């Protein structure tokens, strides 16, 4: 589904993120928790306030899951296998919520990479995130 030029755009975009990986995942989560407050029910045992040590670690866990998908873009279901299982069976995440995190992640990159967030690149990042979400929600389907 993901063209050679989506793959180039997404690897490029992650390139510039560099070490701001975990950070930007932290902030995407905070955007999701503040903009879409239903999402907070999944993290009760979390303190979700600004600068939470817990939102940073998890934010780094999410950033490495995605970097892993990028690294294994042509075999995302096997890669994300164990997280598909976590998210649909154990946690029973509502699929709509993947669309919301995706959006907050696209918003975070937009804010941190003004030059790289061309229309073309935005499309590719949207497609990449939609494929990851499709994987994460595939043990419902």
């Amino acid at each position: 589904v993901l063209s050679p030029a989506d793959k180039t755009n997404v690897k490029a975009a992650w390139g510039k993120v560099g070490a701001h990986a975990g950070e930007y995942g932290a902030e995407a989560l905070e955007r999701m928790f503040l903009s879409f407050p239903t999402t907070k029910t999944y993290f009760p045992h979390f303190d979700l306030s600004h600068g939470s040590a817990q939102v940073k670690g998890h934010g780094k866990k999410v950033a490495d899951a995605l970097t892993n998908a990028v690294a294994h873009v042509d075999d995302m279901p096997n890669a994300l296998s164990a997280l598909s299982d976590l998210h649909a069976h154990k946690l029973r995440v509502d699929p709509v919520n993947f669309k919301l995190l995706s959006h907050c992640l696209l918003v975070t990159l937009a804010a941190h990479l003004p030059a790289e967030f061309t229309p073309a690149v935005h499309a590719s990042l949207d497609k990449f995130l939609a494929s990851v979400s499709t994987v994460l929600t595939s043990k419902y389907r």
Partner: protein, 142 residues
């Protein structure tokens, strides 16, 4: 769609810095590029055949401006959003059916374009206020 004064502050404080002439076109363009099925709702709008083609199609840029206007109109009348976007969807006859999701997508694309233009300034709580807005406006067009 009750915005608290802090939410009101955040939205209006940023919306005055908005390059009105262009951000609408950036937002409407990116929608037709990121979600291509939306082109169906136009393409009676010039050539819509690439990023570059879309980004600089004049009727895109022009109707972007209307979109932004439509939005400020929602800003000034939050408590009665269905009555402001009343004659709006009406004066269109049947050009605004689509499905309410694509109003939500347009609104998320705009959020992406603001964050793109304001960076650090488009903080998470500023985003949250705008999401409330885009939400109520989307549901209005319905």
């Amino acid at each position: 769609v009750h915005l608290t004064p802090e939410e009101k502050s955040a939205v209006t404080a940023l919306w005055g810095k908005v390059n009105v002439d262009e951000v609408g076109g950036e937002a409407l363009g990116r929608l037709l590029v990121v979600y291509p099925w939306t082109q169906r709702f136009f393409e009676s709008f010039g050539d819509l055949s690439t990023p570059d083609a879309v980004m600089g199609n004049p009727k895109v840029k022009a109707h972007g401006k209307k979109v932004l206007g439509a939005f400020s109109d929602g800003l000034a009348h939050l408590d009665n959003l269905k009555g402001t976007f009343a004659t709006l969807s009406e004066l269109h006859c049947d050009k605004l059916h689509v499905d309410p999701e694509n109003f939500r997508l347009l609104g998320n694309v705009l959020v992406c374009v603001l964050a793109h233009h304001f960076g650090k300034e488009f903080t998470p709580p500023v985003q949250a206020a705008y999401q409330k807005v885009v939400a109520g406006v989307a549901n209005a067009l319905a």
